[PDB]
Symmetry: D2
Subunit: 327 residues, 4 copies
């Protein structure tokens, strides 16, 4: 089992560099950095992380094909590959509608766009002169002027079609879920895509980009996760809420409280233990270990400790290293 | 007189950081970094520069509004402002047609786009929630989540209209020219724009983004600048070649030789001494000083030593520091 | 009033770099780093601080003349001056007997050694070829091979004689005290030394290297400072305890409790409010401001927030910046 | 065969960091940094190299037991081990008489001092509380307060006794020589020491710390080496000079010209081709490969490209990577 961790550039990069360094010392394999125009740049951030780490792999989790031309993304991830000595990996997703509305971006044909963008990027990184005339992406003789070395590409995917596409073209899949039921479905979609492309499905690093919260005190752990779990439930499609036996009505109820900023309600009972059990990996190290082994049995090969990671980051990272990674 | 220097990310960022540090030690005020998808990322590069410098101002010279959404540009330059302690400055231009053709980008309405992008960026950096519905740029409630501090914005401009627009909205103008005749025309355009906006024209940092080549041996200096002068002449609009008494036919002749890669012709006599005198600041420290003071008299407030800088960068940077900046 | 802050390399340098950066943003003038063989190297630590800061002054507080040959100290502080663009300042003291016993070092003639070491160091930094044949320090034609620029030298001093020597040769004095009574005596000593050397006593930056603990909640503040105050009282010479009306017997009682590790006694009443008032600057921002202005009236020109700084570092640094430095 | 490279801090650390990064990309295993009070600090330099590299091993080549108390050396190399993620290696030698004279340091019992210092350092790094009462080095309960991980220790040695001691206690030996004849003798000495200690002699990394100069043009190569070779000669014991048929007169001759600053002399005659063959590995890649394979057959396991490396460093580092390391 590979282990990764996620940091949001809502903190200065220098502070994140320390968490990433700590992760490297604790045995993590990957640190992933979110990309949203409203927080710090994903690349200046990756640059200070690369300078302050030595062996851990790093990369965006996930950037997209719309806020930056794919040639710029290729050049950027390659730059981080050079600075870090080949530890860069590219996480690309279609982007989320909310962020795009604010940016005045037309989310047009996510599927085709993403596939074309990844094809173009793989060719750039590969050193080829790129010429494309796709339904969304086009290049006429573009080419990088420095060498990239090898850069794995992971797709961010939730929907059945994106999952299938990931099995067809990605080296890994970052899935925003925490429960075995969700990965049971995801693994099948990835498998269909893998066969459709004729590649061995076990080639793809199926990873759980989970809401993670660990602590020796389980109630301290769940409390740190409630708000995040709330936002997850608020944005979960009916189909998913269904799968976990969670009243679809609870979504509106929670969306409401969030709209009103009534976090007192969220902590007060709105976030039920069922929501916590279905949308996060939390509790004591034992609780988290059990969930992790269930995911392993279903075919998950990398587990990423996503926000909040735990009540206090530094202590949680150490807990994970000592009580989990050291298996 | 302020002094700046330009570096192209066709060299690894670590090597550029040393040149930048040396420039800081030699008394330069600004280092500017070019932005082209085919070289290293302008931002990962600015990040390593920021970490290895302390007081010199830094920034892209120049990025654009098309290869990255303006919100991403705001976030990135603000990120560099945070890391460097407020030493970031933003250089924005409309971009060059050649690069955009390769990237499959429609250069649509450079003027309106650039104006709207700068208005949006100033608002982001300023901490406002941005809502726009311009003819090229739109945002719906977008807003940065961290504070930017103050970030001056410089426009890259060559054409009369861009120049006028810079006088109307920018804090400085990076003009790709080297001769007083060109700046005589540019200063008038900037002045028209400044009056059109009701601001004091002396607020804008009129800067000469020149082709610079300095050495104790003048012939070593001109030879280092010929190829660059060639590309400048090849892309100069008839109107400009005219102004310097350079046969407009020479442009085709040189464009030809460049197409065939016959640099032996370029060095052999195609680049005339007249072209060198009109499109570059080069020679010995005295020659360069004379030209610089001529530009100063015309109203130039910042001189940037652009490529090649000199036969060997390290020695040239020291020469400029010792024989020019120390006035 | 200048403001400084102290960090002990008992934390990794990367974590300290963030606190130092924060201090820079909060308006501090100096960050000082302690030097003891048992924690991280004072210089590798200053190196990562220099790379992650831009304007704040940095330096050891304080290193000494025994654990490293003075020529090495000269070279090291000059190396940090180069990397940081001239923000290095040298804090040198005679060293503490406890640390030296462990290192098997004979604390021989602190006074003469310190004076000779500082004379040699000033000459190295100044570019001179050094030749000395003092009663403790000797050099025969030694000389730095790179330029240092200017580096102020601060002496660490507690005793009347060291204080006098500081007034005679240092640019500043780091005094381990927090109460006006102690600085009343110190300022006289520094003045005697200043006159003995014929220099204007107001040239020296008289600074209070104080035990500092600030918080909106005063009791949270004093509790964070008790253990540190305990060790201060435990090591205070009878003369000093006397000056603050503190039973000299309390020193043994506290030393005992410390020996037995009975910190429950220290928190339980052993550390009296009188000890807290005489050996630390703590309480709410108002309490701290009052003490600071008392020190200012006595002639203190720099106040350093030494350990613990506050219940939690990050929050305390921000408190000091907002409720104190912004005067 | 392992490959290493040496840099002297007579250049700013930022510039060295690029050469080190390049070496990492070109396949070198080790970069070694010299330690002399007159150049930049060996540790601030190692700190910037560590931040700008990722996998290559780094360390002082070589520091000593006299200019810094061994506990400080332990703490410093441990600090670099932490920052670099365990890539630190310690090179310790007895120091050279010329540097010590200038520093006013009595070179007392190099052998016992070096052995005791290494024993103390291994114990510090190992986490032990150190107590020693040797004939040169003493400690009373000293102990590091942070964990070092593993740090190999290499000894710098030329003399037969130092070589024997290295075989007895070191993990590797950095020998200042370039010719098989010298390594034939050294390997025997190291073997005697290894048997005296009962360890397998093939445990020690016998390395040639050679004067190296490589270039497609053998003559520009040997000219780049003349100065370094001059200093190597003027410092060779007559036992050595005699070993290479070089007139023991040529040392006073060369030494004189050095004191005079007469480098024209060294370049135009005093440094003979006998001296170049005797004390350096230089010519074309083929010439260098032949010599390297000769050393390999004699038992050398690491070859370090020491100054000048080649006519121009950057090009030489690439030549070695391409035409030698890629074997
Ligand atoms: C587009 C969407 O795909 P999705 O996989 O559900 O996307 C939801 C989220 O994964 C997506 O918004 C992400 O980018 C969110 N996201 C982040 N997004 C960010 O922008 N930044 C982040 O840091 C972030 C982190 C992150 C980590 C992992 C992860 O999986 C997601 C993350 C969708 O609904 N797809 C459906 C429908 C497909 C469909 O038909 N879409 C197009 C296809 C058009 C064509 O085929 O050309 C259509 O309508 O025509 C499907 O996959 O079946
Ligand atoms: C668009 C063009 O502008 P220009 O200023 O002449 O363009 C030349 C360059 O400044 C521009 O191509 C640059 O971005 C090139 N450039 C680089 N370009 C890059 O992309 N990146 C770099 O790193 C680079 C370095 C550089 C440094 C400084 C600098 O001055 C320019 C640099 C132009 O022709 N403008 C005309 C007319 C423009 C016009 O009329 N507007 C639109 C109408 C828009 C509307 O109203 O709807 C039209 O032409 O259709 C004018 O200035 O009057
Ligand atoms: C030497 C000593 O000076 P002192 O000022 O009392 O020393 C106390 C401390 O300053 C000394 O232990 C420090 O180095 C502690 N110290 C640190 N020391 C460290 O080793 N590391 C640190 O990072 C640290 C932090 C610190 C910060 C500020 C500061 O004020 C000093 C700091 C002393 O006792 N001096 C007396 C007596 C001097 C005297 O005449 N006796 C000696 C003088 C030598 C001679 O005769 O020439 C002799 O005769 O034996 C006096 O000043 O009156
Ligand atoms: C002391 C001397 O040792 P040596 O090994 O010949 O020393 C020559 C060099 O290795 C030594 O001066 C180095 O520190 C030089 N040196 C550097 N030294 C530096 O100071 N800085 C550097 O960065 C540097 C570069 C370098 C890299 C590799 C390398 O091998 C050496 C380097 C010597 O005389 N050794 C004799 C024995 C001497 C002896 O026995 N005398 C004493 C021994 C102590 C005792 O009695 O126990 C005596 O018996 O009294 C021997 O090896 O047989
Ligand atoms: Cl910096
Ligand atoms: Cl690194």
């Amino acid at each position: 089992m590979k282990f990764g961790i996620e940091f949001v550039p809502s903190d200065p990069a220098l502070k994140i560099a320390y968490y990433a360094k700590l992760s490297e010392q604790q045995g993590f394999d990957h640190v992933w950095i979110t990309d949203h125009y409203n927080n710090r740049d994903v690349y200046s951030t990756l640059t200070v992380l690369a300078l302050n780490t030595n062996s851990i792999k790093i990369g965006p989790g996930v950037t997209n094909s719309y806020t930056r031309n794919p040639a710029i993304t290729a050049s950027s991830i390659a730059s981080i590959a050079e600075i870090s000595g080949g530890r860069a990996v590219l996480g690309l997703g279609p982007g989320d509608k909310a962020t795009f509305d604010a940016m005045g971006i037309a989310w047009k044909k996510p599927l085709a766009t993403t596939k074309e963008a990844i094809q173009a990027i793989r060719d750039f990184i590969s050193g080829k002169k790129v010429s494309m005339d796709g339904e969304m992406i086009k290049f006429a003789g573009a080419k990088l002027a420095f060498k990239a070395g090898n850069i794995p590409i992971y797709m961010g995917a939730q929907g059945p079609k994106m999952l299938e596409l990931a099995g067809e073209i990605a080296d890994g899949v970052l899935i925003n879920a925490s429960h075995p039921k969700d990965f049971e479905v995801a693994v099948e979609q990835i498998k269909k895509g893998a066969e459709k492309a004729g590649r061995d499905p076990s080639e793809v690093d199926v990873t759980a980009y989970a809401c993670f919260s660990i602590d020796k005190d389980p109630v301290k752990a769940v409390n740190a996760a409630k708000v995040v779990v709330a936002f997850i439930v608020a944005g979960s499609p009916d189909l998913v809420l269904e799968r976990h036996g969670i009243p679809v009505e609870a979504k509106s109820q929670i969306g409401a409280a969030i709209a009103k900023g009534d976090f007192g309600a969220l902590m007060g009972g709105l976030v039920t233990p069922q929501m916590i059990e279905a949308f996060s990996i939390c509790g004591t190290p034992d609780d988290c270990m059990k969930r992790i082994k269930d995911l392993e049995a279903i075919g998950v090969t990398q587990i990423v400790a996503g926000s909040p990671i735990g009540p206090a980051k530094e202590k949680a990272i150490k807990l994970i290293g000592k009580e989990i990674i050291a298996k």
